[PDB]
């Protein structure tokens, strides 16, 4: 897949992703906060079509992500991110995708997610998160 | 004067300032790095003219500021930033302005300058710096 | 359980834990690094006996934890940390305990674990980790 690295920002305003209930996460894009104004991150697109879009619009800054969870599993012989859930201090968004495979969970007790990196081929292969105070 | 606050970025690529050899620092602007791409900061301008511009073009990311020094003093009844010097790991830029009044110096043993804030009227009234690892 | 919170230090030198192959993790204690010298953390003990102790002595500072993983699950109606694994840049320590229930994984791409907190009753109920650059 095609590696991506958005880098670090001041916070998160919106997450735009796509998923297919038979495969995995496709598209991934983030509108960050940069010093009080939005910064629209690059759209990281799947090489394949047929995904369902979802917009996770956050009430920045009073609403922030406290947990990212999901599932990883095999799709056409590739280990990919099959499902994602975003839990904030105000609401739960998801699960989006297929809740099958091996679960993962990143709860945050102190600090914030300020960026994302990873790789997308036909699906979201992997991802990592930048954390900051 | 008018307060300004650029916020925090990933590093510094260029500093564009203006000064007068009889008064103090005038305009102040920074081209920041933002996750590997230039981010043109707003040009914070004096309400008067007659300054001399300087461009401090850093060889980013191998060159970075290790010490900021200068002088503060009274100009027409106002305490302002009269002079500035930027010392990097490669060379010294300045002094720019008038080396008179009270000196100040910020050497950095570990870390980086990642942002500026302050205020400008006829001259640079004051400034602060964001520091990060 | 009895809550504990070691707070933050400068690194990790040794982890002393105990487990039972039928239940979960029992005791937990850490020898931290505090500015180049060992700092012996308090022993956080189970309310019961019958656990198998293990010493994870790290070659500090060249050796450091890159991933913590494990399993959480029900023991006598309580959700507890059933197993732990500590992976360093040199070796994998574990799994210790019972690898049954729901897995969790914290890989660290950049940064270090500098502290632990949690709660222990008959078993380790929950835990969190302090992360720093």
């Amino acid at each position: 897949g095609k590696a991506f690295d958005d880098g670090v920002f001041t916070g998160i305003r919106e997450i735009n992703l796509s998923y297919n209930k038979e495969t995995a996460i496709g598209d991934f894009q983030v509108v960050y906060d940069l010093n009080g104004s939005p910064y629209v991150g690059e759209n990281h697109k799947s090489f394949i079509t047929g995904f369902t879009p979802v917009k996770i619009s956050l009430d920045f800054p009073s609403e922030y992500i406290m947990e990212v969870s999901g599932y990883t599993g095999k799709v056409s012989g590739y280990v990919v991110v099959r499902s994602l859930t975003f839990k904030t201090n105000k609401k739960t968004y998801g699960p989006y995708g297929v809740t099958s495979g091996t679960p993962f969970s990143l709860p945050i007790e102190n600090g914030l997610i300020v960026g994302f990196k990873g790789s997308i081929g036909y699906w979201l292969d992997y991802f990592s998160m930048y954390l900051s105070l | 004067g008018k307060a300004f606050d650029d916020g925090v970025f990933t590093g510094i690529r260029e500093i564009n300032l203006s000064y007068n050899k009889e008064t103090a620092i005038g305009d102040f602007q920074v081209v920041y790095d933002l996750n590997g791409s230039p981010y043109v900061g707003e040009n914070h301008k004096s309400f008067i003219t007659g300054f001399t511009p300087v461009k401090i073009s850093l060889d980013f990311p191998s060159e970075y500021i290790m010490e900021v020094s200068g002088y503060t003093g009274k100009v027409s009844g106002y305490v302002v930033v009269r002079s500035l010097t930027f010392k990097t790991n490669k060379k010294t830029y300045g002094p720019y302005g008038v080396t008179s009044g009270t000196p100040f110096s910020l050497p950095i043993e570990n870390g980086l300058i990642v942002g500026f804030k302050g205020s400008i009227g006829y001259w640079l009234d004051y400034f602060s710096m964001y520091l990060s690892l | 359980g009895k809550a504990f919170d070691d707070g933050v230090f400068t690194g990790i030198r040794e982890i002393n834990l105990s487990y039972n192959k039928e239940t979960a993790i029992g005791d937990f204690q850490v020898v931290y690094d505090l500015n180049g010298s060992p700092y012996v953390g308090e022993n956080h003990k189970s309310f019961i006996t019958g656990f198998t102790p293990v010493k994870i002595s790290l070659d500090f500072p060249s050796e450091y934890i890159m991933e913590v993983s494990g399993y959480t699950g029900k023991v006598s109606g309580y959700v507890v940390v059933r197993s732990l694994t500590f992976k360093t840049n040199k070796k994998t320590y574990g799994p210790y305990g019972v690898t049954s229930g729901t897995p969790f994984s914290l890989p660290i791409e950049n940064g270090l674990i500098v502290g632990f907190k949690g709660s222990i009753g008959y078993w380790l109920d929950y835990f969190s980790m302090y992360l720093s650059l």
Binding site: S128 | L58 | E109
Partner: peptide
């Protein structure tokens, strides 16, 4: 270098 750093957790998925 002159590049700011941040804590990074992950990756989750392939590798």
């Amino acid at each position: 270098s002159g590049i700011s750093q941040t804590v990074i957790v992950g990756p989750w998925g392939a590798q």
